[PDB]
Amino acid sequence: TEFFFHTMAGREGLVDTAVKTAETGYMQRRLVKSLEDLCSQYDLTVRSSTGDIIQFIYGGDGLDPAAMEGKDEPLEFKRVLDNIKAVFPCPSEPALSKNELILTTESIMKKSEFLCCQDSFLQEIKKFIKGVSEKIKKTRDKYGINDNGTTEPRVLYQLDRITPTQVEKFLETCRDKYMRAQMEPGSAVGALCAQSIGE
Amino acid sequence: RITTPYMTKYERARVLGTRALQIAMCAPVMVELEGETDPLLIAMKELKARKIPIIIRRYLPDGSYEDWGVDELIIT
Amino acid sequence: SGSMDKGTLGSGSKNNIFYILLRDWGQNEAADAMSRLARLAPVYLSNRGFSIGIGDVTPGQGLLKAKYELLNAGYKKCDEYIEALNTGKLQQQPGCTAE
Amino acid sequence: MLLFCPGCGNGLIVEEGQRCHRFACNTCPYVHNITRKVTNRKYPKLKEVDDVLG
Amino acid sequence: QGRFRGNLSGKRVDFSGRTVISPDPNLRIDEVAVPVHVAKILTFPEKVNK
Amino acid sequence: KEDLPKVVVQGIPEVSRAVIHIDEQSGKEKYKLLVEGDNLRAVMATHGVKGTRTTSNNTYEVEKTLGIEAARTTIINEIQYTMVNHGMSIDRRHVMLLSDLMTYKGEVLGITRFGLAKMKESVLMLASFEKTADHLFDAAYFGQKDSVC
């Protein structure tokens, strides 16, 4: 009886998959035949074949879903900061405090190459910088680390160690990733959407 | 000047294909190939050297156009 | 630290070492790393030996005892519920009937 | 409710006669006057209180 | 099997083959092995250049 | 005697079944209404119902009641929820593009042949998808010139 019930379940699954194959095949055919006309133009506006605009900007922001590092987000600031700290450790430079970190961030972000970047990404960068600066402040207040750089135990500076070089590297890497993660004009976005919804 | 300064993968592909076809059609080489019998390899070498004499003509949907040099654009 | 698994080397989701290589150092580095892994893992797996036998799936004495006790308890509770429903009033869960 | 004539067995409609309402058959002169009250309850199942699932 | 679906949208082409697959981890991810028998049939037109 | 027992005395005729769902959040246990009907306007118009936070599954009702943007948002949320139920995730940009393409003419047009014809204009594509002879003869009658865009 147990073997018969197991065979029943197996055949049920088999027929389910058999119906699913054809059903999803038809659905994919329809979705692709309907969405094969859209394309990303050079002015960041998704337009149909007749010239009508479907979206003034793809996804509201204009980022490539294939180049999405985070969960529906362009970058994971924590991972990028850790990678920058690990790849470029500067032992000959002192650590930065909250005020110094905020000052260098505001001075670097106001450059020309950062003007063309979207405002939301800059606001997210500012929020992450403020968060890490508050964390550094809390750490230094817990361990009484002085911003002057004359504390006797230097190992205390290794808890949250940040140098302006690492800050600049992090900002440049984030900007480059955000610029290279945008929708490249000419891509058949409609067909990609149809396939990603059909599969 | 308003479009993205980065050279997309589609532009890369089309430029490489056109240059490979031209080289296969007895076009002059500007990188002094070293035993490369494959035209696509020569095209990739010219792209990496930024010596492809091709200017992309990006058209806007309304009708406006803009010229961008291969050496002027940014490659990855 | 840590041991590699599908969560780090598999094609499940982000946080994959090959994904980090692709996003940090380009495509060629990730391809070379994948080739090196595909060329190294088989050699070590063959030199070490990995096999499965009937003894790898046989149950233990304590396992059989626990299974027997659990089956007895479950059958007793099922019989109690059957007796409660057939003869008497059984607590009806919300949003559904007694059966 | 459904009632039948003892004569032929067809359904009995209710009609207003010259003195009082009466059951009558459409295929014969048989009639039956109503003397006392006649009722036919159905007792529908009501709505029950349903519960706060969740 | 109409003209739109059978001869315009999807149509058969030449210079193509169909074969069974087998594992081979000694090749790169961007590389594929082709048998000598099929390689001698599928030809590529190369233009004679300098 | 056969129709009187089925005459409504209270409630919306379109509503067939409504249940009291409860969310047991640790902060507070709240109650909501899950209605298995096809009338959102009546549900929102009823007393004691917070019409500002009322959603629905039928896209046509949302379109007809709260506009086309509400229909787009409902389509996006419903597709995302249906996809998450199976444990598989899709980038929100794909569903956003789909909903916009379905809601760029002011009316929710489906992917079927009817909506595809109402949206697209190329004769060759419509003839290739479905209704080949019908669309071809209609174009020959209208003399509609089809571009190669």
Next chain:
Amino acid sequence: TVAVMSYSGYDIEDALVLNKASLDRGFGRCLVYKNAKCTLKRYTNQTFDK
């Protein structure tokens, strides 16, 4: 004599590794027989296929 184990990574997904000497000594050797039929029929006229 099958041995359940991983070897050379050439048996990743459902594939199996065969022994060269086993196949050399007759293991798995198979025979395929095909038929080729021809007909020499007489037509209406007094002529036959030769």
Next chain:
Amino acid sequence: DDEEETYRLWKIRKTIMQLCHDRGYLVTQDELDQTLEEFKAQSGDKPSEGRPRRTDLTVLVAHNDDPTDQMFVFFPEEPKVGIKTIKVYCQRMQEENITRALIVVQQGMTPSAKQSLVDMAPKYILEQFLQQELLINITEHELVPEHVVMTKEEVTELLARYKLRENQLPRIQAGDPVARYFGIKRGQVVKIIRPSETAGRYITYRLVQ
């Protein structure tokens, strides 16, 4: 009755005030923030409350555009409005020289009355509104984004920045609930601010057609 009817009337009045404020008409803060106690003080019973006359509004004037422009709001008492009532409202607006008027029906509009209202006059603009729809404000709904009717200058700036035409913009039917809520006509453009998952917003545009 006498408890839910007055509540519906108060909520409809508040929704009409919010709609007039969104359209740009002149309405004081007291009319916008009107509690149920004030409505009871005005009328606390159904028979005492006058739907056809006691609830009518004539002070609605577009102070931002021109004080001379006047808008009227009607509340027919009968469930279904006939041709005679529409003609009476039209001649009343003619006497009072009012071009824009609203009709808040109770149950619906007869097909003949609808067809007549459609072709009353290009100068006499009357919009049909069901009380069931006005019991909830469409703008306050979480799904409905923020809509703002753009002026001709903003439309020209948009078309110049994007180098587009009017027909190339996304369409939105005139019969859309939001379209009738704002009373936008053919040719006008509406900017929509969709709230994204992040702190940013997505700005789009739609043309009435």
